[model samples]
Target chain A: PYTVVYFPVRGRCAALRMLLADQGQSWKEEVVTVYQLPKFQDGDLTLYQSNTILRHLGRTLGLYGKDQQEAALVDMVNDGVEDLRCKYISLIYTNYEAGKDDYVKALPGQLKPFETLLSQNQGGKTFIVGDQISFADYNLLDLLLIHEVLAPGCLDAFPLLSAYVGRLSARPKLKAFLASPEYVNLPINGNGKQ
Target chain B: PYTVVYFPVRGRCAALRMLLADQGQSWKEEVVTVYQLPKFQDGDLTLYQSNTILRHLGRTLGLYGKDQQEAALVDMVNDGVEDLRCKYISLIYTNYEAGKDDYVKALPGQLKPFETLLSQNQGGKTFIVGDQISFADYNLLDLLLIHEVLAPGCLDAFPLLSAYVGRLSARPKLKAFLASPEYVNLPINGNGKQ
Candidate 1:
C-alpha cells in the first residue's frame, strides 16, 4: 500500500517521505499538482519513477536482502546510489551559479570511489552494507542530506562521510524525525520540487 | 568462477558477459586496459561498476529473491536497464557527432516504453518478464543488442522487440556464444575495436 506523490515540496519526495517515516509506515502524502496529473490519473494511482519510487520503497521495506551475498550488496548499493548520485547531482546542479570552481574541480574525481568505500570500513564499522539500515545506509544518508543542503561545508570534506552525517543525524528516530513540525516542509534545495 | 575486469567490450561488460554466458558460468575475460589501471592495482582485483557487475553477477547467481518483495522486481528491471540505457549511450557518445535528430527524433519516445513492455505480457507471454529467462530477459536482450548495433534497421522498429531479439538470439548457449570469434570483436561503430 503506497501513496506519497510529490511537491508540497520535500523535493523528490523527501527521501521517500523519510523512508516512510523511518518505517513507522502508514503511507499517505499525496500533494501532486500540475493540477494534480489529470486528477491523479483518474485515481487508483500508481505513478512511479523517482528512481522508481525508491526501488519500490526499497523492496516494500525489507531493504534488499535474504541472501545471494546479501542480494548483491543490494545491487551494489543500488548501483552505487544510482551511479554516484548522478555525480552528486552534477555537483549540486553545478553549485547553482558561479560555475562552482569548475564544479568543485570534479570533487576528487567524484569522491574517489566513496573515499575507497570509506577506507574499507576501518574497524569502526557503521554501515555501507550488512550492518543494519541498508539501502546503502539510506543512500548514504540521502546523499549527505543533499550534500549538506547543496554544499554547505560540503560534508566537511568527507571525514568518513562527515562521521556518517553525524552518526545518522543523532538517531532517536532520526532525531525526532528531524525535529518534527512535520519536518519543516522539505525542498532542502538541490532544486527538487521543480 | 568469475574473473571479468572489463574493457573487453559490449560496453559495460555486456551485462556481466551475458550473465556469465547465461549461467553455464565459466568466466575469465580479464581484459581491462586504458593502460591497465596501473598494472591492475597489483592484482587483488575485483573492480566493478558495469552496473556493479550486473548486480554482482545477479547476487552471485542465486538470482535475487527471498525477501524485499522478492527483490523488488529485480531492482525494477535493473533500474529499467539503467534508465533505458542512458538514452542509448546518449545517442552514441553525445548524439553521434550532431547528425542528432535526437536519437532519430526521440525514436517514438524510446520505442514506446519497450513496446508497452513487449505488448502487455500478462501471460500472452512474449517475455518482458515471467516464465523464466530473467536478468530482465537478459537485460532486454542486451539492450536490443545495442539497438541492433546502433540503428541498423533499428530492430525493424520493434515488432515485439523484433520478436524479442529473435527469442533471445536463438538460445543454444546464446547462439553458440554469439557466433563466436569472441563475439566478433564488439565495436559496431563506437570506434574502439572494430
Candidate 2:
C-alpha cells in the first residue's frame, strides 16, 4: 500500500524493496529518470531523501525492533551501514580513481564491526541484534551485497558475514525478487557505477 | 545513569550531550585519549562508532519520537544531519584547504532542506517533527551551531533556522552546559579544527 518514487537505478531503494519483498508486503515504484527529476520536483511528488523513505517504510511495516533497547541496537546497525555506504558512494562518484585503492585497502577494517556484531549474537547464526529480523538486517544485507559488487570476494574472509548473506538471500520471496527482471535490469547505482 | 566513552573532543558526542543537558538527565563521560584507545578496546569496553552511540542514547532517553510514524520522521531528520555532518567532517579534516570555497558556496543548497522542513512544520515555531522535542533537534541544533562557527552568518539567510538555533540554545540547563568550561575547553573536533 506504499509507493516509492526514485530514479530507475536501485541506488538507495534496493534495501527497502528487499524488505518489502521479504515481508510479503506490496508496494509500487514510481520511477524517475535523471532528466525528469527537475520536472518531477515541480509536480506534487512527495519526494523524500533515501534513508527517510527506508525508515518510514520500516516504521509502518513493523520491522524496527521489539522494544526500546532492541530499537537502539537496530539504529546502531543502520547507522553503521550508512557510515560505510557514505564511504562507498564517495568512492563510486567523486573519488573513484584516486580513492579506490585506499578504500579497498581499508574495506576489512570498515566491515569488521558487522562481522563482530554477528559473532556476538547467537554465535553468528541468528539476526544482527535479536532472533527477529529487524529493518537493520535488510539495510545490512544491501550493504554486504553492494560491497560484494564493489569488491568481489570481500566477504570471503569473514565467514559470519558470508553465511549471513547466504541465509538472508535464501529467503524465498527475497531470492525471487533479487533474481526477477525488475531488479536485475536496473543498475546497482546511479551514474552507471555499481 | 549513562556513560559516554569517547575521545575528549566534542565532535560526535556534542548533540547527545546537548540532548542530555536539555532533558535534565545526568550522564558521565569516559574520555579516552588517542593513545588509550587500543587499551580501552582490550578491556571489554563495548565501543560503538560515533553515530551508533547517539542513536542508542536517543533510544534510551525517549528523544527518538512518539510512535512509529514519528520515529520514522526522527530517523529521517537524523539521517539528514549525518549526511551534512559527513560532508562537514570531510571539509574539516581532508579538504579544508582546497575545498573550502566550493564547500561554502554550496552550503545553502545543503542547508535548504532543513529550512524547508522547518517552514512546513508549525511555521518554524516548535520542534522539528511533532509537538515535543526529538533527538533530531539536538543533532540539528549542533549542526547549525558548528556551521555558524565554520562560516559566520551561515544561518542568517534562514530566519527559522536562526530562531530555531536561538530557541534551543536558550534552554536553561543547556545554556549552562554550553557556557561551562567542560564544553568550551574542548575543541569541536579532535584534529584541532572547529
Candidate 3:
C-alpha cells in the first residue's frame, strides 16, 4: 500500500520495485515528468531522496535485519551497492564516451568484493548477509542486472555472483514481475541508454 | 571501545568522529595509509568502505534513530549528505580548478533542501529528524563545515543552515574535539587541499 513517485525511467526505483514485487506487496507509481518536479515536491508525496525511499520500505517490510549488528551488515552491503552504482551512473552519464574502456577493464576488481561477501556467507549459497533476504540483496541484484547490460558477461568471472543473480531472479513472484510488461517496458535509465 | 580503520584523512570518517565525540564514546583510530590498504584488508580489520563504517558505527552507538520511520529519515539525510559529499570529492580531487566557480554558484540550491528539512522540524531549533540526535546530524554538520572552508561564508545565505552548523559545533564534547590538535592537524581530505 505505497506509491512511488519518480520519472518513468526505472533509474532509482527499480530496486525498490523489485523488493516490493518479491515481498508480494502492492505499490502504485506516480510518474512525474522532469518539468513537474516542483509540483511533485509541492504535493508532498513521500518526500525524500531515492535511497531513503528504499530504506523506508525496507524498514516497514522487515527487510532491514534482526538486530543492530545484522542491520549494520545490511547497511554495509547496501552502501557497497551504492558505491558501485555511483560509479556506474558516472560512466553512463558523464564519462561513458571516454572512460568506458578503463571502466570495463577495472570492472572485475570492482565486483570481486561482492563475490567475496557471498563466499563468506554460507559458502556463496544464500543471502548477502545472515539467513534472511535483506534490502541490500535487492540493491545488489539490480546492480548485477544493470551491470550485465552495461558489460555483458561481467559476472561470468565471478561464479558466486553469477549464481546469486540467477537465484534471486528465479523467485516466482520476482520472476514474473521482472518479465511482465510493467517492468520490461520501462527504460533502465532516463537518458535512453541501457 | 571501537576501532576505525581508514586512511589518515578525515574525508569519510569526519561525521562518525563527530558522533563519537558528541555521544561521549571512546574509540580508537587505525590510520591506514594508502600504501598500507592492501595489508590492512589482509588483516581482517572489519574491512569495508567508508560509508559502511559510518553506518556500522551509527548502529552500535544508538545514533541511528528512535524508531523505524525515524531511521528511514535518518538514512535519507545521510544519503543526501553522501550525495553532496560525492560531488564535493569530485571537485576536490579532479575538477577543482575548472569546476570551482560553477560549483560555488550552484551551492545554495544544493544546500537549500537541508535548510527546508530543518525548517519543517521544530523551527530548525533541534536535531535534523527527531528530538534526539541521529547520525545524519553529525554528517550534515560536517558537510556544512567543509563547504564553509571550500567557499567561505557559503552558509550565510541559508540562515537555518548557518545556525545549524554553529549550534551543532557548539556541543561541549564536539567543540573540544573540533578544537583539539588531533582533529585540527589532520587534513580534511587525502589530497591535502582543504
Candidate 4:
C-alpha cells in the first residue's frame, strides 16, 4: 500500500518499481512532474532516494535477516551498488567521452568484492544468505542490469558477477517479472535521474 | 585492533576518529600519503571509506543497537551524513567569484532538509534520536565543525541546527574532544587536498 512518487524515466525509482514487481507487491506508482514535488511535500508518502528506497523495501519485507553479520553484509553490498553508481555517474556526467574507458578500467576493482561475497554463499546455499532470497540478491541484479546497460561489455571482465547476476535473474519470481510489460517496456539504459 | 589508514586531513576520517575517541577505543591512525594508498589498494589492510569505517565502529561499539528497524534508520542517517558532505563540498570548492550564481542558488534547499530534521527532533529528545548520544550526534558535530571552518556563518541560516550544534558542542565529551591538541591541530579547512 505504499505510493512511490518519481519521474517516468527509470532514473532513481526504477529499482523500487522493479523490486515491487518482483516481490508481487502492489503499490501505487505516482509519477511526479518537476513542479509537483514541491506541492506534494506534505504527506506520509515515503519519498526516498534510489538506494534509500531499496533499503526501505529490504527492511520492510524482512529481506535482511536476524543475523547481524548477514545484515552488515547486506549493507556492504548496498554500498557497493552505490559506489558502482558513483563511478558510473562521474564517467557519464562529468567525463562522458572517457566513460567507456573509465568504466572498463574500473570494472574489476569495482566488482571483485561481490565475487568474494557470492563465493562465501556457495558452500551449500543458493542465495546470498541461506536457502532463500535476500535484499543482497536484488541489489546484485540491479547493479548487473546497470552494468549491462551502461557498460555493455563490462561484466565479461568480471565473470563471477556475470554468473551471479545470471543465476539471480533466473529466479522464478524475477524471471517472470522481467518478461512482464513493465520490465520489457522500461528504457533500455534506465539510469534513474531528475 | 583495527588499523585505519587515512589522510591527515579530517575530510573523510574525522567522524571515525571522533567516534573512536568517544569510545576510548585504541586505533592506529596512519596519515595516508600518496604512497600509502597503493597499500590500501593492495590490501595490506582492510581499506574502507570513512562512513564504512564509522558503521564498522558503530556495529563494533554497539551504537546501532539490536532492532532491525533501528539498524536501517542508522544506515539512513549515515547516508544523510554523506549527502550533507556533498553539499558542503559544493559550497566550499566553488570558485564563488567565477561561478557566483551557479550552485549558490541551490544551497538553501539542500540545507533545508537538515533544518527540517533538526526542527522535527525538537519535541523528541536532546539529540537527533532518543535522549542520548548516537552516531547521528557524532555526524552532526563533525559536519558542523567542517561547516564552521570551511564556510563560517553558513549554518546560522538554519536556526535550529545552529542551536543544536551549540548544545551538542557544549556536551562534556564533545567539548573536551574539540579542545584536545590533536583535534584542533588537524588540517580541516581551506583547501587542504590530498
Candidate 5:
C-alpha cells in the first residue's frame, strides 16, 4: 500500500486524496505534527513535492492521458493549474489581509484560460484536456473549490468554471470523501485565511 | 517548422531554445516587441507557457523519458527547476537590491535538491532523470547557468551540479548554441539584473 505523510490541512493533498478515493484506490494516511513537506512513500521510493506525488499516482492509475500528445496537453493543463496555485498560496499565507482585495479583482483574468480550455474541448462538457479525467482535473477542482471560500461569488462571473466545479464535485466517491470528517475537519490551508 | 514568439531576452526561452538546437531541429524565432506573453505556434496549437511548449516539443521529439516512471521523474525534476526559476525571477524583477543578499544567503538550500538528484544518478555523470537527454535537463541547465550570473560560483559548493553543467554545456550543438551571437547578445533576464 502507498503512504502519504503530510499535515492535517487539505492544502496540496486535497486533490491527491480525492483522486485516490474517486478511483477507489486505497492508501494509508500519516499526518505530520509539523512541517516535513508532504512526503510520499511507496516501496523503495520516497518522494517529496506534492505534484511529484500526483504525477506518480496519475501514471500508475492511468490518469495522465491516453497518448503522447494527450499527455503533453495534460501537462500543459497541470502547469497552468500549478502556476495559479502558487499565486493563491502566496496571497493566502503571506498577505491575505492586504492583498486579498487585489487578488479577487484580478482573478477573472487568471480564470478565463481554464474556461477557454473547456470551450475548446466539446463545449465545456467533459474534462479539461480530454474526454477522460486526469490528475490535473482533480488539482483544478480543488483550486476552484478553495477559491469559492476565498472569495464567495468569485465563480459567478465564470459560467464554465462554476459548472465544472459542480460537475466534478458530484462524483459519488469524491462527494462522500469531501463531506467525511477526515476532510471536513481540517482547514483549507495551513493558516486560517481561507 | 515550430515558431517561438517571445521577448528578445533569454528569460524563459533559454532552455527551450537549447533543447531544439541540441536536438538538431530547426525552428523560426518570432520576437515579440511587447507583452503578449511567450507564445509558441506549432501547426494548430499556439501554446503560451514555456514548459507547456517544452513538453509538447518533448513529446514530438521523444525527449521526455524512457517510460512512465522515468517520465514522472522527469516531471519532478522539471517542477523543482520551475520553482527555483520563480524565485530567481522574483528576485530579479521585484526586489533585486533588497532581496539579493537574502536570496544568495538561502541559495544553497534551494540548490541542494538538484545536487541530491544528481548524486542519486550514477555519481552525477548523466542527465537529471535518466540516461540520455530529457527536456528537464535542458531546463535545469539553463537554471544553473543563470544562477552563476546571479551569484557567481554558486555551484562551487555543489560539486555534482558544477560538473553536470560543464558536461551538458559541452555537447557539440548545445555548446555552439550557447556561444552563438543570438544567445550571447541577449540579456539573461528582461530586467538589467542578471
Candidate 6:
C-alpha cells in the first residue's frame, strides 16, 4: 500500500528497494532527475528523504527492531553508516580523481567501526543489530556493496564486514533485485562517477 | 540515569545537551579526544554516532513524535538537515579555505528544502514536523546554529528558517544552555576554524 519513486540518490535507493522486495511487498519506482531524493507515499502520507523513507518502511513493516533498546542500536548502526558511507559518496561524486587513493587508504580506518559493530552483535552471524534484519542492515549492506564496487576487495581487511556483505547479498529476493535492471542499470552516483 | 561524554562532534552535541536541560533532566559530560562520536551510556547501554544518541534520547524522553507518521516526518526534516549540514561540516574541516566562497554562495539553495518543510507545517510557527518538539527539531536547531556561525546573515533570504531558529533558541532552558561555557566556550571547529 505504498509507492516509492526513485527520485534521486539512485544508488542510495538500493537498500530501500531491497527492503520492500525482501519483505514481500510491491514497490513502484520511476525517474525523477531533480535534486530531490526518495518521495514515499503511503495512504495519505507522502514523505521525502531517503533515510526517512527507509525508516518509515521499517516502522510499517516491523523491521525497526524487537524493542526500544534494539531499535536504538539499529539507529546507531545506521547513523554510523551514514557518517562513514557519506564520505564515500563525496569521493565518488566530487573528488574521485584527486581523492581516490587517499580515500581508499583511509577507508579501512573508517570501516572498522562497522566491523566492530558486527562483532558486538551475534558475532556477525545474523543482521547488523539483532536476530532479524533492520533498516540499518539494508543500509549498511548497500554501503558494503557499493564499497565493493568502489574498491574491489575493500572488505578483505575486515573479517566480519566481508562476511556481512556476503551473507546479506545472498538473500533470495534481494539477490534477484540486485541482479535486476532496477539496480544494475542505474548509475551509482547522481553524476555517473561511481 | 544516563552519562553522555563529549566524545566528538563537539559542536554537534549542543542539541543533545539542550534536550536534556530543556526536558528538566540532569546530564553528565566530559571530554574524550577521539574520532569516535558520542559515548552515551544509558544504564548498561553504550552508543556512538551523534544522530544515534539523539534518537536514543528522543526515545527515552518521548520526543520522537506523537505517532509513527509524525515520527517519520521528524526524520524527514532531520535527514534534509543532515544532507545539507554535512556539507557545511565538510567545508569547515577539509576545504574551508578554497570551498568557503562557493559554499556560502550555494548554501541558500542547499537550504531551501528545510524552509519548505517548515512552511508546510503550521506555516513555521511551531516546532518542525508537529505541534510538539521532536529530536529533529533539536538536530536542525544545531544545524541552523552552526550555519549562522559559518555564514552570517545566511538565513536572511530564508524567512521561515530565521524565525524558526529564533523561536527554538528562545526556550528558557535552551537559552541558558546556549549561553553557558559548554556551548559558548567550545571552539566551533576541531581545527580551530570558524
- Give per-residue CA lDDT, model 1, range A1-194, as digits (tens): 65665555554455655666776765656665540211111135344455555655665566656554654555555565656666555555664465556756665566555656755755325765555665556666776676555556765666777776677777667667777776675555435511
lDDT of 4 by residue, B1-194 (tens): 65666666666667766776777766666666540121112123253455555655676578763564555555556677788686566555665454434544565676676667666665423666544566656876787767665456778787777778888778776678778987888777346521
The fnat score for candidate 6 comes to 0.72
Question: Whose TM-score is higher: candidate 3's or candidate 6's?
Answer: 3
Best model number under lDDT: 5
DockQ list for all candidates = 0.14, 0.38, 0.51, 0.26, 0.49, 0.58
Query: Cα miss at A86, model 1 (Å)?
Result: 21
**TM-score for all predictions?**
0.31, 0.89, 0.91, 0.81, 0.95, 0.88
Question: Which lDDT values do the candidates have, in the order given?
Answer: 0.59, 0.79, 0.81, 0.63, 0.88, 0.83
Worst lDDT run of 10 residues, candidate 5 chain A, spans A35-44
Could you give candidate 4's per-residue lDDT for residues A34-152 as a string of tens digits? 51121111135343456656766777787765565566556666666776766666665576675677667767777777766667677423665555666667766776786777667
Q: A115 in model 5: Cα distance from truth in Å?
A: 1.9
Candidate 4 local Cα displacement, residue A25, angstroms: 2.7
* iRMS of each prediction: 9.0, 5.0, 4.1, 4.9, 3.3, 2.1
Q: Please give, as one word, the docking class of candidate 3.
A: medium
Error of 1 at B75 (Å): 10
Q: Give the alpha carbon lDDT tens digit for every residue of A114-148 in model 3.
A: 89989998988989988889889999999999999
Deviation of model 6 at A148, angstroms: 2.7
Sort every candidate by lDDT, greatest first.
Answer: 5, 6, 3, 2, 4, 1
* lDDT digits (tens) for residues B1-194 of candidate 1: 56665564566556656667767887666665551210111134354456555655555565554454434455555666667777667666664767445676666566667667557666224566544555666776777777655556766766777777887788788877777777766654344421
**Candidate 3 regions off by >4 Å?**
A34-45, B35-47
Strongest candidate by TM-score: 5
TM-score of chain A of each: 0.31, 0.91, 0.92, 0.81, 0.97, 0.94
How do these models rank on DockQ, best leading? 6, 3, 5, 2, 4, 1
Reference-based lDDT, residue A33, model 1: 54
Worst 10 residues of 4 chain A by lDDT: A34-43
